[PDB]
Amino acid sequence: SVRGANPLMFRANVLHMLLEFVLDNLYLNRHTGFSQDHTPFTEGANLRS
Amino acid sequence: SVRGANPLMFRANVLHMLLEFVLDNLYLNRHTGFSQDHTPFTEGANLRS
């Protein structure tokens, strides 16, 4: 049945998914510019754009 | 008679039959291959193909 997955390989499939999850998230954050917001709720806070 | 046999020749005929039976079995067994059972019938045992 193309609509199902074998219960015996759930652990292997989950491990492969987890490995892909990590390999996707291997990155480095990049600094960008900020903006000073004067909305009444937040005064003076520099918000990333 | 085509459907009749001589009773006194039974020992010789059976001996020749046993000789042919032995001669048919002078063979060696090959190693062909295996495939793990993906189904939940067996406990993941290898099945010869």
Tokens of A12: 């292997």
Which residues are CB-contacts of B38 (< 8 A; sequence separation ≥ 6)?
A6, A8
All residues of chain A having their beta carbon less than 8 Å from the beta carbon of residue B40 are: 7-8
Spatial contact of B10 and B26, defined as CB atoms under 8 Å apart: no
Interface test with B, best of A1, A8, A11, A13 (most B CBs within 10 A): A8
Q: Residue B1 is encoded by which pair of tokens?
A: 């008679």
Strands (E), chain A: 34-36, 46-48
The alpha carbon of residue B48 and the mean position of all alpha carbons in its chain are separated, in whole angstroms, by 18
Residues written for chain B: 49
Nearest Cα of chain A lies from the Cα of B38 at a distance, in angstroms, of: 7
Tokens of A39: 């909305």
Do B49 and B31 meet the contact criterion of CB atoms below 8 Å apart?
no
Q: Which positions in chain B touch A7 (Cβ < 8 Å)?
A: 40
Count of other CB atoms within 10 angstroms of residue A8: 13
Question: Looking at beta carbons, which residues of chain B come within 8 Å of A13?
Answer: none
